[PDB]
Amino acid sequence: SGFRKMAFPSGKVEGCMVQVTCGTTTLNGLWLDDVVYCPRHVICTSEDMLNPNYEDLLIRKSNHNFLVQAGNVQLRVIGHSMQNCVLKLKVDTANPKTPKYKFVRIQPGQTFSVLACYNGSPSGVYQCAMRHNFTIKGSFLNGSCGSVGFNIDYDCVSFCYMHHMELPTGVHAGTDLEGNFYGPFVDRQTAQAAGTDTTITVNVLAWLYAAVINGDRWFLNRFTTTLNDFNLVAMKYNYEPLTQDHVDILGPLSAQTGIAVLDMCASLKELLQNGMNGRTILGSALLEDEFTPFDVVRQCS
Amino acid sequence: SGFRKMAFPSGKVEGCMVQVTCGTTTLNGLWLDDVVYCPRHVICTSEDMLNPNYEDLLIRKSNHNFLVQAGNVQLRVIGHSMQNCVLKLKVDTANPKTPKYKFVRIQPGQTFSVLACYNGSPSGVYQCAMRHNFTIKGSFLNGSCGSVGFNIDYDCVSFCYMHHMELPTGVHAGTDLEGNFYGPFVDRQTAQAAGTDTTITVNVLAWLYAAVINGDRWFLNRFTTTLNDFNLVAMKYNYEPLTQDHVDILGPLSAQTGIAVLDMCASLKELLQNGMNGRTILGSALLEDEFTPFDVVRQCS
Ligand SMILES: Cn1cnc(Cn2c(=O)nc(Nc3cc4cn(C)nc4cc3Cl)n(Cc3cc(F)c(F)cc3F)c2=O)n1
Ligand SMILES: Cn1cnc(Cn2c(=O)nc(Nc3cc4cn(C)nc4cc3Cl)n(Cc3cc(F)c(F)cc3F)c2=O)n1
Secondary structure: OOOOOOEOOOHHHHOOEEEEEEOOEEEEEEEEOOEEEEEHHHHOOOOOOOOOOHHHHHHOOOHHHEEEEEOOEEEOEEEEEEEOOEEEEEEOOOOOOOOEEEEOOOOOOOEEEEEEEEOOEEEEEEEEEOOOOOOEOOOOOOOOOOOEEEEEEOOEEEEEEEEEEEOOOOOEEEEOOOOOEOOOOOOOOOOOOOOOOOEOHHHHHHHHHHHHHOOOOOOOOOOOOOHHHHHHHHHHOOEOOOOHHHHHHOHHHHHHHOOOHHHHHHHHHHHHHHOOOOOOEOOEOOOOOOOOHHHHHHHHO | OOOOOOEOOOHHHHOOEEEEEEOOEEEEEEEEOOEEEEEHHHHOOOOOOOOOOHHHHHHOOOHHHEEEEEOOEEEOEEEEEEEOOEEEEEEOOOOOOOOEEEEOOOOOOOEEEEEEEEOOEEEEEEEEEOOOOOOEOOOOOOOOOOOEEEEEEOOEEEEEEEEEEEOOOOOEEEEOOOOOEOOOOOOOOOOOOOOOOOEOHHHHHHHHHHHHHOOOOOOOOOOOOOHHHHHHHHHHOOEOOOOHHHHHHOHHHHHHHOOOHHHHHHHHHHHHHHOOOOOOEOOEOOOOOOOOHHHHHHHHO
């Protein structure tokens, strides 16, 4: 029993984290096989970071301009190239700790683990979700650039996020490992700000099922709603539309608990309309939306 | 910016996790140097687990009764002994991945990371606190026995918890790595239940400082209270007494924010007396008490 914000074990990722320095600019890199991946922002000097032309900046660099440190061992850079917003530094040594891995891009509403890293040294691990506005509500300080987000499936690390920058609201923006930003952001100083966000409805329902599995039942009721009638209410509260795809994905949790999805939607409707009235669900006084149906099934069974 | 339930990177602990089987009973063990540590409950058969005499059960076992598996490698057991509620199995191979480590016992209100493990295979990592009733609000399923809790200081893993059992309320009980239970619990079937718990006041204050560091200031006020007057109010709400020791520990956060501890106590008093009125602090609608002052300083600076 119990339900926690649970991350994947981070060891397979810790073994790939390195420090990359270009000039006086330093950040974190990801060392897989004989390649180090890092944000291309590392090639900016303080005068470049505002409005850089990255193709110009990279043409002006040599392999010897990049210092890659794996612990107390320098890795010799023998090639460099840029793929969108990530730099690829070919090194003369394959990482012996390379796990089985993939580069996958995730969807808003999906979750991943973040290994926060400073000067190539891992500091902490936490769980977060990609928001509907393609930001993440992370926890990052100066020096965290290049930290990565990932999921683990069996033995395979699926890397899905590399951290670039903090937006004015304190939320975070980054790329997939192909260098393509999540959301309408660029790796330079502009007026960019996060767009409007919504509550991830299917995740809230998954978490209500987690609560029932853990014996929190006070919010259940005898009612069932239609999908259309639920969506009419949920949108008024800035909740994402619930689809038949979402209902289908919640099927296993509905089976384990014996509560149909549209029956649980009637609980959520009442919680939205009435509040929680001084009570809690799984130790929270808010409706939590950063657990996916798969996260709940993984943790509760 | 940002504030998350953040665990320590778990790789140093993953490299020590093994599976221990005695008869048909299986659980997780911790392999450090040439010793495997695990709950002594592993020597119980289904008929023994209710009311065992462990000294009797261990005298009836041989080294060959213990199967220790480190991944796909069997470790040869060459000695066995029991220290309180933990079994020590001496193996013929020192773990090459042994980190620098200590066995430390923690205090109620302190936090640690948990590496949840099943069949010797790490599954997830999360953060929790030792409660005042010496339980933890963990997330554990069948097969998690022997999972460990730890903190990391520089390069040194301080192991502080090994998981034994789930109590009827769904909270969790275990030992330090010397085999000594946290709280008045025993590794057998009795009427044992968790005693009354309290809110960890110094942690709530630390988290309010975290909120201020992150720009959440709506709960601040012009007032300051005395320590005695705060404690008179906080106890009515089942909060632990605040001591001058706690005030002193909060000094660094008070300095960074420029808010005296007794000034912040006046905010907490008002939050307790008035509620939160539909607003949130660091994304929560409750006062969070599982971040220590050290956790806040580590994460916010
Ligand atoms: C508070 N916070 C939360 N997340 C972050 C991530 N982050 C970062 O770690 N570093 C950044 N700028 C740098 C300054 C450097 C100074 N030296 C010596 N080396 C440095 C390296 C960097 Cl990367 N930034 C800012 C930033 C990073 C980008 F990748 C980008 F495209 C635009 C930006 F404004 C940063 O956000 N800090
Ligand atoms: C739901 N939950 C949450 N935490 C836990 C931890 N936990 C556990 O993992 N296993 C336990 N009993 C076993 C049965 C076995 C069956 N086989 C084949 N092997 C087994 C090994 C164990 Cl350890 N228990 C119960 C339990 C474990 C103790 F160490 C103890 F002293 C008393 C107990 F009732 C358990 O709580 N499950």
